Symmetry: D2
Subunit: 333 residues, 4 copies
């Protein structure tokens, strides 16, 4: 299967395409569905506030985009059941709308004539892959899979290294996270969630995330052992996850950092830094997660020890590189 449709040509959807082209995948994006015109999708693909001009030619007709000379159909169907995926034979749907995050809802793509769906968000109790952590759980028989959230892709590889080297007995995470499209520009209603109603670029905004809760799906041994949340803050992309853990062994910072260094060596999904970087330095990252040895902290009082480990992530592009790695493997099974 080398035929993809993108449902939801948003921040993640457009970057899926940009990254497919960047790595010369033999995947062919043949169709896109959204809620707008080809003219507007083309404007948006061409001009990006976070990543700058598209590196390839972009043009449009009344029913398509022309991206680096290839035609991609554009549809505007509110309900996935009505999307004509059969029309151009879209086999694998990259589900990036946020509105189909369960096997029940993403079934509508299959009903509509697609074979597989890769959901770009947590999608409940289904297979949930962080590339280079648990992508060997994938088989030929899988039809609807999740690559979880940006935060899950940041946390999982750090948690996994810690769990493998030291054991994690219990832990809590806080991500200091760039604001996203689910939040508000000015204070006003945003469904039921009171905090999401507040002006995102003018506030620190606590926010729920399931990355830690649902880590069970990626790292089965940590199931139920982690909790966490986010503080959404006014940067446009680039985020950082802090994990505070009780480990199964007494450790030093040096030891922790060496264990992480090993886990990131020749690891295309998981990077390492001992440089004094800030969030803008992670924009454009090709990793799902970048461990930052400069922020490691061990608080010890006798036999008790809290270990804080910190990893950066580009919640847009960095996450997308993990989505594509997983897509490329999903496509070959």
């Amino acid at each position: 299967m080398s035929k993809v449709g993108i449902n939801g040509f948003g921040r993640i959807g457009r970057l899926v395409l940009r990254r497919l082209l960047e790595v010369k995948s033999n995947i062919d994006v043949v169709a896109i569905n959204d809620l707008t015109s080809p003219k507007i999708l083309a404007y948006l693909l061409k001009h990006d506030s976070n990543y700058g001009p598209f590196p390839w030619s972009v043009d449009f007709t009344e029913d398509s985009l022309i991206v680096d000379g290839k035609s991609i159909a554009v549809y505007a169907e509110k309900e996935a059941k009505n999307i004509p995926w059969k029309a151009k034979g879209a086999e694998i749907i990259v589900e990036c709308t946020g509105f189909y995050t369960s096997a029940e809802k993403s079934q509508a793509h299959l009903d509509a004539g697609a074979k597989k769906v890769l959901i770009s968000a947590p999608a409940g109790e289904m297979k949930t892959i962080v590339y280079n952590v648990n992508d060997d759980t994938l088989d030929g028989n899988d039809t609807i899979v999740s690559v979880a959230s940006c935060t899950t892709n940041c946390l999982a590889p750090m948690a996994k290294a810690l769990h493998d080297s030291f054991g994690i007995e219990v832990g809590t995470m806080t991500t200091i996270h760039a604001y996203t499209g689910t939040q508000s520009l000015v204070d006003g209603p945003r469904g039921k969630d009171l905090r999401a109603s507040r002006a995102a670029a003018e506030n620190i905004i606590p926010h729920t995330t399931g990355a830690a809760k649902a880590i069970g799906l990626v790292i089965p041994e940590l199931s139920g052992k982690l909790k966490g949340h986010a503080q959404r803050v006014p940067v446009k992309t680039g985020s950082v996850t802090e994990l505070v853990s009780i480990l199964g062994k007494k450790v030093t910072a040096e030891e922790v950092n060496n264990a992480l260094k090993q886990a990131t060596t020749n690891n295309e999904s998981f990077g390492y830094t001992d440089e004094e970087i800030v969030s803008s330095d992670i924009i454009g990252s090709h990793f799902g997660s970048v461990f930052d040895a400069t922020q490691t902290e061990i608080t010890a009082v006798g036999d008790l020890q809290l270990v804080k480990t910190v990893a950066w992530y580009d919640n847009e592009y960095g996450f997308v590189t993990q989505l594509i790695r997983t897509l490329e493997k999903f496509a070959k099974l």
Copy 2:
């Protein structure tokens, strides 16, 4: 005619209530319509990212707000014609949703039992008032009235003063304007305006406005003599309007500033400053416009002269002060 309803309890609508309590108007707001729950409306009213905590007590029930101890009904009817304005006797509707910006649209509130409608926005060729420029044109027969935009309330008093003192033969305006809820948080579709699709807190974004174009509604002798546009920029509120004019007389800067100063004297709508202020100093202003003498500029070669005059405005609260002066006059006709 002292009982009011607010349709659209947004940036403008919530501030309408705040300003009304602040000046202890004899006007009572007896009902609110929006699209959400009293809980959410009360949360937004209590906590404001731009003006801080509401200065009175705020609580709610399943169908009401309780503000400063007074009960205000809350309805959630998306079509104005369905709002049960008669239940609490709402007579004047302050229309702040953005969705009824015409006589044809806003007459739905009359169908729904109200007596008059004041529209918080330009609304085509109906009676349109900038308080202390043309509120003397209001009469007993006016049933649907507009107060034009924030930008109109800024531009008009400056243009009026220039018109009366010197003549404006032609002019062009640029307002450098705070972002608003019609813009986008992250890059993505925002109706059909391509620029409006771009991340508002991360861009200078050219934006069309009608303030100059429709100035004839407020200053009839300047009908068709002005054009202009906006540059939307990343401040939360607070804006500034520049007008470049060919006047009907040769002038000096001191002479323009003195004329403006005279027009702002005992003028509750139109302030003056010669202080080196910046936009956050205008937040919370009780004027619709504050002329800034430090920015006046006369550019002349022989008989060819360009005059640049600049005024600040808090496009949320300052505009709201104008809306409320207009409302209090409208209610006593």
Copy 3:
């Protein structure tokens, strides 16, 4: 009664005046030292990007400010020993410059003729007060004293309550903190701290703070039990401190929240909220810290329990209210 001098009329030092006038304190501020002219200090006092217009009249002469009709002498001596504090009889110095944060350095004010110094920052091993936590350790003999940081003033009352109710065995803190004047507007050298060189309004920036490390000066039984750091983010003021603890007893969330609530009752320094607030809601707070029951989290596995507690603080005005409470007491001893 007591005559005060302010050294460093910056963000903090200006708000010290504002808050003293706001509470109608008996303290008279008779002198200010900074590095600039009365005209510039008057401009800055009058117009504040975070708190708006000064609530009292502000004027200047060539050597003073006139504030609400009262004269305050202005000096510009970069070395504190050259400040003529005796000329106006300034007895208590509020040291707000950043450059005299030790007993040895602040001694220069005593040499220059002041009697006491209160330093608006950590200042090594001196008496270090968080009002309503340990202000009872002050006595008539103290002549140089610290009120620690904003973060300490947020952290200490929350750590005190947890300590008093449950014991803290070990803990780690992260504060997501507004940017301040120690940081950089654009990427450029900023002393020796590499991360402080980076554009503050455009980045999440890891940053060291001694709040947790030196907490033993305020709560001696927690000496050595806490560590932490900051992430500096693009909000202009308003900050939040998370603390992850192992406590000496097993607990529920409700139980933690009730203990904190009791601790905040009739506590003018330490507030409580169960509302879904965001950082701009803390701006202008009259508390040093506001505990947020909505963010409390207990992660538990077997007999292991991590407890996350979170408190907001207005690192500018809120801290200042603490500084003023301490100042009022220190001046009467």
Copy 4:
């Protein structure tokens, strides 16, 4: 000579070196002077909040940078007359500190052993070059020259084009400009410029600029015929210049646009767009100026006409491409 030194390794100084490497220049940067250590300079060069990772290797020793394998000497001499430019034979100094913006001040570099200085800012009455507008006025005997400001490089080619096609009789300019390091992060003294004291990322801040006033240095026929100013706003780089002119002929929008379009054809310095861009789309531009046809406006009343023309500019990288074009020519004369 082809050996260059940079004085002021700031936003402009560092981008000078990046651009020199990017276009594979002949020029050999042999020395840098600033105020700090090689370590700090290396960190700043390597990590850039606006343009991302340096595309070449960066290391340092105690007295040098090593960039793409080449050693560059670092000095820390706050007075230019003391910079030891003869040690590595720097012949042309790119003066980017902002402290030597006159002939008399930059003479210090010649006293210090250099032959020529190119000042990255206006510097009074000396040859002032906007590349592809008046670079042919440079000759073999010029030793101190200016490239003016970012704004000048944006305005001049638009003005030149309008002047050549229609005549400019008189005109006034407003640039909506990214904040820069001359401004303040938080409200605090900034020399004598009151508006520069105010928090740059939280305000619209009127600011003077000589772009229009000194335009006669670049286009002598326009001397005295233009004036203008800036509004500094909260975007990190990327700016826009609006010019309102009385022209020598009556025109249509299409006529202005086609004339501009012709002046931009095969012009490496002056670009054209008819796309609906916003400021972030100009970041990384290799033009000094990009004329934007979508914003052209003609306001006409009988006999009279005002013509608004607008061009974007990356006040950092864009301007730097102009500086480098000029430097390459200067070095070969």
